Each structure stands twice: as structure tokens, then as C-alpha cells.
Amino acid sequence: CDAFVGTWKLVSSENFDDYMKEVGVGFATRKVAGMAKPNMIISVNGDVITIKSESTFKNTEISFILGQEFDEVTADDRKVKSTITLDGGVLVHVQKWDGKSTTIKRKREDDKLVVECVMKGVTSTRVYERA
Ligand SMILES: O=C(O)CCCn1c2ccccc2c2ccccc21
Incomplete structure (x- = not known):
């Protein structure tokens, strides 16, 4: 993966509070995390x-x-x-803990970087664009 390389700013987010809640994130954390507009910097060295x-x-x-x-x-x-793999141009990231699992998919769509976060029945979609 390297069509992902760059610096990316969050421009939209849907259902992220629901997602964090489903993952088990406490309210104090959700509050601050939810207002966050992060910069994501992706690089590759070999x-x-x-x-x-x-x-x-x-x-x-x-x-x-x-x-x-x-x-x-x-x-x-x-x-x-x-564990992260590259699957048809999609970066598939699975986190496992306490017999639970969540998946973060990062994909390139037009000039967007689209991040889909899944926990149980909850799907959150977040869009980044180049800084
Ligand atoms: O990459 C994303 O945008 C969401 C998945 C990773 N992520 C964050 C990114 C930016 C700010 C807060 C959080 C966060 C908070 C809880 C869980 C996963 C999280």
C-alpha cells in the first residue's frame, strides 16, 4: 500500500460516537474523541x-x-x-481483544481516503482529504 501515502485531514464523520460506545469507550473519552478532527499521516519505508x-x-x-x-x-x-492486510486496494485492519473483534477499512475513493469502522451492528464512516 502506498496510494495511501500522504497527510490527510478528517472532513466528515458519521456514527463515530455509536461506534466508540459499542467498542466500550467511556463517555469522558467519547466526548473529546468525537470533537476531534485528526490529521492522519501515512508513510511507507520498504x-x-x-x-x-x-x-x-x-x-x-x-x-x-x-x-x-x-x-x-x-x-x-x-x-x-x-493484523493489517491489503485486499483489492483496501487496507483491512482487524483489532482483537477479549474475544471481541473490530474492523477498520481504509480505502482510496476519488481524492478521498475513506475509513469504515465496524463494531457488531454499528458502522461508522469517516472521510479524509489531502491537507
Ligand atoms: O481512524 C479513525 O478515524 C477512527 C479509528 C481510530 N480512532 C480514532 C482516530 C482519531 C481520533 C479518535 C479515534 C478513536 C477513538 C476510539 C477508538 C478508535 C479511534
Whole structure:
């Protein structure tokens, strides 16, 4: 994946509070996270992909190789087992913790980067555009 490379700003978000709630995010965290308009910076150095998220809420960063499981501390402080693959141009990211699972799909659509977050019956869609 490298059509994903760049700096991306959040411009729209749907159902993100519902999603965080379903994931188990406490109210105090949802409040600040929900108002957040993060900048997402994606870069690639060989087989290592780095995704940063910067906002007044929290700075986070993951570095990974496609198809190799890694430990992630999420923005909401979950300790999860993450695996990311590239599937028909789609970056598919699964987080597993406590017998639960959530999926984040990042895809390129026109000049948008579209992020779909799924937890149980809840689907949240977030759109980023180049900074
Ligand atoms: O990438 C996204 O836009 C949503 C998935 C990752 N993510 C955040 C990104 C920016 C700000 C807060 C959060 C957040 C909060 C809880 C869980 C996942 C989260």
C-alpha cells in the first residue's frame, strides 16, 4: 500500500460516537474523541507502513508489516492484537481483544481516503482529504 501515502485531514464523520460506545469507550473519552478532527499521516519505508494520527485529543502511531500481527495501544487505551492486510486496494485492519473483534477499512475513493469502522451492528464512516 502506498496510494495511501500522504497527510490527510478528517472532513466528515458519521456514527463515530455509536461506534466508540459499542467498542466500550467511556463517555469522558467519547466526548473529546468525537470533537476531534485528526490529521492522519501515512508513510511507507520498504515493507514497514507507518500510520500516525494527530489531534488535540491524542497522538497515536502504528508501524506494521502487512499480514504480521502486532500489539497496539488504541486511542482509547485498549491493548489489542492487530493484523493489517491489503485486499483489492483496501487496507483491512482487524483489532482483537477479549474475544471481541473490530474492523477498520481504509480505502482510496476519488481524492478521498475513506475509513469504515465496524463494531457488531454499528458502522461508522469517516472521510479524509489531502491537507
Ligand atoms: O481512524 C479513525 O478515524 C477512527 C479509528 C481510530 N480512532 C480514532 C482516530 C482519531 C481520533 C479518535 C479515534 C478513536 C477513538 C476510539 C477508538 C478508535 C479511534
